[PDB]
Design a protein around this nucleic acid. Structure first.
Ligand SMILES: [Mg+2]
Ligand SMILES: [Mg+2]
Length: 226
DNA sequence: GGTGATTC
């Protein structure tokens, strides 16, 4: 849950979530074009404020002033709502990070094989996030985290954890300011997209290096190498 | 107050 792709246009991601009137997001036809989105960068993050959807560039990582460790990039759904650290973000900082799919590295012996995981039906994924509001302030240390869950069914074949991916319906409800922390927990449990909705393939090991940013990084290898 | 890779 530490790398993903966000390569399509804003409209490609927003079309499934709301009518245009519900957005305060300027039209932009340019694909976001990111094939290797890394922790510690600014990522376009979707949230609701002032009764409209907003898209803000937000640091992927969370390190409050009292936190003297490396910024956290994930929050476990099992405990985040009651965590002394994450509870205020669960209540007031919910957001969505949309993506084409995400990468996981399957460990085999002492080496890894990266996989690109995506919805078989072609839809983008809406990953549940929590973060430090107000998002538009461009904070350098207190940004957002991707909520994770235990891997289910086939995804356990790759890694023990997975991002909490919500249906488009659940993703919209997740962002609403009217929805409480407890109601957010209900959405997280009932809205998680099951692993059987995803397919995956091995991709080039070049994706491991965050300096690599070509479109080939999400494509299937021509020959699986061991 | 917690959870990815790098000829690191
Ligand atoms: Mg060994
Ligand atoms: Mg600050």
């Amino acid at each position: 849950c530490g790398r993903f792709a966000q390569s399509q246009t804003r409209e490609d991601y927003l079309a499934l979530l709301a009518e245009d009137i519900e957005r305060d997001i300027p039209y932009d036809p340019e694909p976001i074009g990111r094939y290797n989105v890394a922790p510690g960068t600014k990522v376009l993050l979707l949230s609701e404020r002032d009764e409209h959807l907003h898209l803000d560039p937000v640091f992927w990582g969370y390190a409050p002033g009292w936190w003297d460790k490396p910024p956290l990039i994930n929050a476990r759904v099992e405990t985040a709502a009651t965590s002394r650290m994450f509870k205020p973000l669960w209540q007031h900082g919910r957001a969505i990070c949309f993506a084409d799919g995400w990468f996981e590295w399957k460990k085999e012996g002492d080496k890894k094989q990266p996989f690109f995981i995506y919805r078989a039906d072609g839809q983008p994924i809406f990953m549940a996030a929590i973060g430090s509001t107000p998002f538009e302030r461009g904070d350098e240390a207190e940004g957002f985290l991707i909520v994770t869950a235990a891997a289910d069914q086939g995804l356990v074949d790759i890694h023990d954890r997975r991002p909490l991916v919500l249906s488009p319906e659940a993703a919209r409800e997740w962002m609403r300011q009217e929805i409480s922390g407890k109601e957010a927990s209900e959405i997280a449990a009932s809205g998680c997209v099951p692993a059987n909705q995803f397919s995956w393939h091995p991709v080039s090991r070049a994706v491991g290096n965050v300096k690599n940013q070509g479109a080939e990084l999400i494509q299937p290898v021509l020959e699986v190498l061991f």
